[PDB]
Amino acid sequence: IVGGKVCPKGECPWQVLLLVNGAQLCGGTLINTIWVVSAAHCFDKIKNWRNLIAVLGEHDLSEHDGDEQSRRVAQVIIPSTYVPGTTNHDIALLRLHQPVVLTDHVVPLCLPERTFSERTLAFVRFSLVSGWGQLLDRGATALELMVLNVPRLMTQDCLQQSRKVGDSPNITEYMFCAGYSDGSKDSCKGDSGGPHATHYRGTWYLTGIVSWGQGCATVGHFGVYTRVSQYIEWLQKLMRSEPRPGVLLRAPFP
Amino acid sequence: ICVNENGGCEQYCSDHTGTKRSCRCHEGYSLLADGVSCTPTVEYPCGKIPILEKR
Numbered sequence A: 001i002v003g004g005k006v007c008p009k010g011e012c013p014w015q016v017l018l019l020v021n022g023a024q025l026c027g028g029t030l031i032n033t034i035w036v037v038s039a040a041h042c043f044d045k046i047k048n049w050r051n052l053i054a055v056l057g058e059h060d061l062s063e064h065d066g067d068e069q070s071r072r073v074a075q076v077i078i079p080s081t082y083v084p085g086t087t088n089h090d091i092a093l094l095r096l097h098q099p100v101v102l103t104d105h106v107v108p109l110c111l112p113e114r115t116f117s118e119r120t121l122a123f124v125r126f127s128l129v130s131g132w133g134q135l136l137d138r139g140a141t142a143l144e145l146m147v148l149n150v151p152r153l154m155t156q157d158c159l160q161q162s163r164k165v166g167d168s169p170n171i172t173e174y175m176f177c178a179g180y181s182d183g184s185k186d187s188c189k190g191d192s193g194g195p196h197a198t199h200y201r202g203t204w205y206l207t208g209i210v211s212w213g214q215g216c217a218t219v220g221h222f223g224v225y226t227r228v229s230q231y232i233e234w235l236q237k238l239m240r241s242e243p244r245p246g247v248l249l250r251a252p253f254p
Numbered sequence B: 001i002c003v004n005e006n007g008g009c010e011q012y013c014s015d016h017t018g019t020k021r022s023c024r025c026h027e028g029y030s031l032l033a034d035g036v037s038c039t040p041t042v043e044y045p046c047g048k049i050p051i052l053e054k055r
């Protein structure tokens, strides 16, 4: 996260840290005691699916304070429409091997209904994006969880306010822009998979997933987030399904 | 009704037979008698921050 602040410990209790062989991989969002939403692109280069760990209640990566809860990731579900190495349909649904225990430091973010998300949440201007990603473009990643408040743009506006780039990917109906074009504030590659959380009448909801962009906090460019509202029904149906052997599962989308 | 100001609902809104509207809540919440407000029914409802709620 570039240009944000430390999220006070326990104020982003749905934030997930994903590790592979103990190394920082991506962020994620807890949506109930056994399910985490992250980005499909986080898994493009995994070879050993058995060493994927989700950590809840994490804040400071340098110390163990006892609020952290680690769980093995039993299943990674990706839409059939996602193509590794491309940007569209950038979402993954992870089933934890055992539920996390809800505490003051581990709480799920509400996965909203599609209608409520499209009709109401999509019109809330500012939302929070968080993670342990790069503090600067080509800089070190954060030891403490960072958070940034970003405004959402309508896609016509995003394309109009952005600097034209060669081979630049299209912003589809499964994405949305948020952030700033002045190069001061953005989410970064290490924040991939983390939440874009929106407040509405006293409750926070999942509206986006840190997905892609052109260099972190690059002048003339905004952050691009997966538009979670397009996946509510897909996510809900999978959460009612029985687990299947094998960690990776490709599930039909829609 | 739901398209305009969330039909006055705190959380979810469903449109019915003509000018009828029913508000609903996420799991871990129940609807108050005002028909619009959602109150937690569990210790750790989704989307609420305990350290801020207890302060």
Ligand SMILES: CCOc1cc([C@@H](Nc2ccc3c(N)nccc3c2)C(=O)NS(=O)(=O)c2ccccc2)ccc1OC(C)C
Binding pocket: A041, A042, A044, A085, A086, A087, A088, A090, A169, A186, A187, A188, A189, A190, A191, A192, A210, A211, A212, A213, A214, A215, A216, A217, A222, A223, A224
């Ligand atoms: C679908 C994801 O696509 C991309 C993802 C990314 C990197 N993430 C982000 C996330 C949010 C960003 C933000 N808010 N602002 C600025 C930049 C941001 C970069 C990433 O994760 N890099 S990675 O090298 O680790 C990797 C990439 C792809 C697949 C696996 C790993 C950079 C480019 C990407 O695509 C091209 C446009 C085509």
Ligand SMILES: [Ca+2]
Binding pocket: A058, A059, A060, A061, A062, A063, A064, A065, A068
């Ligand atoms: Ca720690």
